[PDB]
Write a protein that binds this ligand. Sequence first.
Ligand SMILES: */C=C\S(=O)(=O)N1CCN(Cc2ccc(OC(F)(F)F)c(F)c2)CC1
Ligand SMILES: C=CS(=O)(=O)N1CCN(Cc2ccc(OC(F)(F)F)c(F)c2)CC1
Ligand SMILES: [Cl-]
Ligand SMILES: [Cl-]
Ligand SMILES: [Cl-]
Ligand code: NA
Ligand code: NA
Lengths: 315, 306
Amino acid sequence: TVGAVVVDHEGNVAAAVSSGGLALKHPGRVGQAALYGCGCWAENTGAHNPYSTAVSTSGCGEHLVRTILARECSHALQAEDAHQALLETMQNKFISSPFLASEDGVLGGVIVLRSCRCTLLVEFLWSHTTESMCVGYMSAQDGKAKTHISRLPPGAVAGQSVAIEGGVCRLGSGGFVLVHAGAGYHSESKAKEYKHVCKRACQKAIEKLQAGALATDAVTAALVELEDSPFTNAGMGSNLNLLGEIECDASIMDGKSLNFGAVGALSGIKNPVSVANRLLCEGQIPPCFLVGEGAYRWAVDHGIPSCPLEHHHHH
Amino acid sequence: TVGAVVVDHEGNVAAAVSSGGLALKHPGRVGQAALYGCGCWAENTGAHNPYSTAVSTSGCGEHLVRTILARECSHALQAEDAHQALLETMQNKFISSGVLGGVIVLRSCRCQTLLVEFLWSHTTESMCVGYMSAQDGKAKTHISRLPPGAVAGQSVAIEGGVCRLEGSGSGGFVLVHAGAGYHSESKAKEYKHVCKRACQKAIEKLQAGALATDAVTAALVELEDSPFTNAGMGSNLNLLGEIECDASIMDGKSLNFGAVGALSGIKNPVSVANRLLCEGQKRIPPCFLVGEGAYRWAVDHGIPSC
Ligand SMILES: */C=C\S(=O)(=O)N1CCN(Cc2ccc(OC(F)(F)F)c(F)c2)CC1
Ligand SMILES: C=CS(=O)(=O)N1CCN(Cc2ccc(OC(F)(F)F)c(F)c2)CC1
Ligand SMILES: [Cl-]
Ligand SMILES: [Cl-]
Ligand SMILES: [Cl-]
Ligand code: NA
Ligand code: NA
């Protein structure tokens, strides 16, 4: 799973997530990266929401679905202390959730940002119960992406412990992006490549913003980079299902309009997040969630780059 | 869309929903009836949940801005005044910020006897519900209408009632709905009839000792099989003339969930969803399958076709 959250120079936020899902899964299994409120969430500031918040999640299994994690984080982040809100959500709402009481371990992660105009004050955080997680982030002003591998401290237990880190940025035509290349087992061998792909992803989003793109276009451009890495379980290199085939989930949410696009169990499309983004764009009753054969056909009919030799129609 | 909610003799609740979705929809479009927390919800009483609650919803496609409806209703039903809670939810999510839909809900708490409060509410012109207790022995069916002069999508109708249950029989309670939409006085007899049969199937399951999820599944199987409901047989055809069904089910005791989306070729979609939930209690087993792979899984598990 990969994800990104973006805030533009006006405080508009967007979030997206993309995954290949559980390795060896049964054909047609759709997980958190496609599901409304579970994989990502983005909500501009409003009447009862004093912060603009964007959330994207990581992990596989049904752990993030059962808890509707992304929307839950977004709601917790309306409290004053963002760090305490996210940490308590990860511990109470995610690890010790009643929805996951029958589990020996709960594995996942999140990236979040929240902004409010005071200039723009952007707080951003990441948190995970996996051994490690690779993040990247960048402001349009600072001009250089920063990447970091977040690890559970010695003595922590994967699936029982929370690591949480973050920071603050003050912010023209700029903005801020936080991305992640996945949460899982530590792989020191692949660490530079995950850091490298997080760096390029941030730069793509910041480039889009600086050129005037919408927050959703910026976050989509970052996810396209993250999918394209053969090392991430999304897009190219997604886990193979039980039949040895690729089936991708992806979704995206716009904080300004609250619109949402998503694809599930999609084969034959190089960048699943692009279909989800196209649905959100066209949808501004248009569909927001397309799966399987029909999703592929819809993407092809909308000019989204395909690959017919990687598309399966069992039927 | 069709739905049902069940409470067993011990206060365990279950909820399910099944739909053919938007007529002429693009192939592969999956709607609320397949989505966790949106189409149905069931949650036994717990630490922060003083009531056992079960919710099933009905909609015509027009998605709500940021709602996750069934789970939102369930949380609203933790307030003292259930009627006011549901009404305020319907008002904010549908009328305030027209959107056409409906809900059925129940909430129970142990007093040993069981107090069951049940409600239905809609912004559609009309909605047909049925309900039955294991004790009363006779199903009740009812057609709810918007008050004369009201405007669909701008008014909320809400009705309900209260039932008490002997807490140690093999009894329970079921509420179903055959859909929320335009009033059709001609088809009213069949809609009340299918809700009656659906309730009795659920009550029969309960009295034989079945789980609440098996009972709610048996009621949705009857509702699906009616050609007048937009679910199972007689579902709206998509843009290419094909049937694609969404369905889901949730267990209040275990909080497990099963769901299918864009499912074709299977007579009773809710049976696949129930089967996924059933198998997920016996690699993390799947809870949500769509399209061809869902059909293949269902066929491989003995669930009937066509
Ligand atoms: C079950 C989790 S998953 O979505 O299958 N997935 C497997 C691929 N993995 C890649 C990954 C793992 C660790 C990691 O952290 C590190 F800091 F870089 F080592 C990472 F960035 C990516 C993600 C989990
Ligand atoms: C949202 C549109 S839909 O395509 O999901 N669907 C289309 C079919 N329609 C059938 C129906 C209509 C009215 C009903 O109630 C009663 F007034 F009693 F007749 C009833 F039970 C069933 C329900 C909505
Ligand atoms: Cl599976
Ligand atoms: Cl459509
Ligand atoms: Cl399919
Ligand atoms: Na990849
Ligand atoms: Na039907």
